[PDB]
């Protein structure tokens, strides 16, 4: 479903910027990996409807962009941590040129809500933790490689409008 | 001999915090990725998503680009 | 009749946290602004600054682009 | 000291992207404003040497980019707040197409150190506060106009390297 890049456009992009583009690996040998973590059903927060449509869409897109997609559902912050640490240690990254991480859940200012989250008992994955687990120390396989993190963490705290008259 | 490497490099985050309420953000992101992956680096696609949300119809959406340590342009080169 | 407008839009932040220690960051930023304002939008100039810092010589610098709500490309058009 | 944009390059930029570039105002009538806040001398933190060279450089650059530059020095977080609220309310923004804000100081994770900052008694301008004071509600004159914020807030907490062998 993705509009393809022509070999002409590819060279045209490479001509406009010399060594300013991330190198891509051979299509036939590369092992691109992506991870989607979607929290739909919660202990104390309302059910996220449209999650299945969102998982489906993102999965199909990332595959069509060349990625193998792992899908994990309804995890606590502890489970997400374990899943992310495993993902960083995946052998496929060594023969990959990039990765995508997609988070779909509820959120707070600090981070992403796990399945067990409540105001009385927090279940939160910090944004800091995602970058830490995927950084150069913890994930040397993705060193010098682009790491795209997409976070949909729904907040009541979200901006936000101001009303005006013409 | 040991060599220095940046602890955190080559990250880009795209963040939506909009109430719920597929979802408007995800759908719009898929659409722009389908259309512009061929011709635009990921950061530009994120900007274009924002542009499409410029007029606040319904619930206002303005997803931010965050914590960018990309040193190069990330082009998806779909088809390759 | 009242109209809705995004509370926060058209911001871009460029952040250096490097110890001190002119300063390396500021000097490098001035240089890239002098050289690329004519041909590159501000976000790209920020990326180019990062690229110049790719190899950690001395104290490592990797200034981040943060909280981007720019919907368009900001070109300085120096001379205009 | 800035390499100039040719009228050819300007049209070439405008042709590559249709309505995707911020509009610039008439050179002869526009009143572009920039603010530099530099903290060099502190109550409890070491003196920031090279500040004068930094102020000079940034000032000359922003002027050569078409901005009138206000320079404020050695302020507390309270003073910075007052200065920023005034800057947001400046009449020149109405006839401007953009602004630059430059912060040069020490920093913590949350924000920028004022002149009186210590671990025992905090003097901190939050990053949140800068965006709030310059947002659409508090600064409607800069609505739909690019606002560039450059923050040099030196931290011991700063990243940061990992050592490796080939």
Swiss-Prot record, chains B, C:
<protein>
    <recommendedName>
        <fullName>Caspase-1 subunit p10</fullName>
    </recommendedName>
</protein>
<comment type="subunit">
    <text>Heterotetramer that consists of two anti-parallel arranged heterodimers, each one formed by a 20 kDa (Caspase-1 subunit p20) and a 10 kDa (Caspase-1 subunit p10) subunit.</text>
</comment>
């Amino acid at each position: 479903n993705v509009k393809l890049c022509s070999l002409e456009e590819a060279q045209r992009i490479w001509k406009q910027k010399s060594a300013e583009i991330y190198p891509i690996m051979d299509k036939s040998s590369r092992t691109r990996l992506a991870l989607i973590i979607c929290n739909e059903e919660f202990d104390s927060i309302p059910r996220r409807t449209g999650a299945e449509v969102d998982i489906t869409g993102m999965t199909m897109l990332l595959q069509n962009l060349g990625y193998s997609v792992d899908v994990k559902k309804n995890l606590t912050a502890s489970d997400m941590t374990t899943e992310l640490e495993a993902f960083a240690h995946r052998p496929e990254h060594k023969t990959s040129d990039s990765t995508f991480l997609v988070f779909m859940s509820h959120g707070i200012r600090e981070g992403i809500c796990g399945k067990k989250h409540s105001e009385q008992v927090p279940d939160i994955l910090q944004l800091n933790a995602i970058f830490n687990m995927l950084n150069t120390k913890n994930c040397p396989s993705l060193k010098d490689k682009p790491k795209v993190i997409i976070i949909q963490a729904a907040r009541g705290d979200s901006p936000g409008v101001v009303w005006f008259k013409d | 001999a040991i060599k220095k490497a940046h602890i955190e490099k080559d990250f880009i985050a795209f963040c939506s915090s909009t109430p719920d309420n597929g979802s408007v953000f995800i759908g719009r992101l898929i659409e722009h990725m389908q259309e512009y992956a061929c011709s635009c680096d990921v950061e530009e696609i994120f900007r274009k998503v924002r542009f499409s949300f410029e007029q606040p119809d319904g619930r206002a959406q303005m997803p931010t680009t965050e914590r960018v340590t990309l040193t190069r342009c990330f082009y998806l080169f779909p088809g390759h």
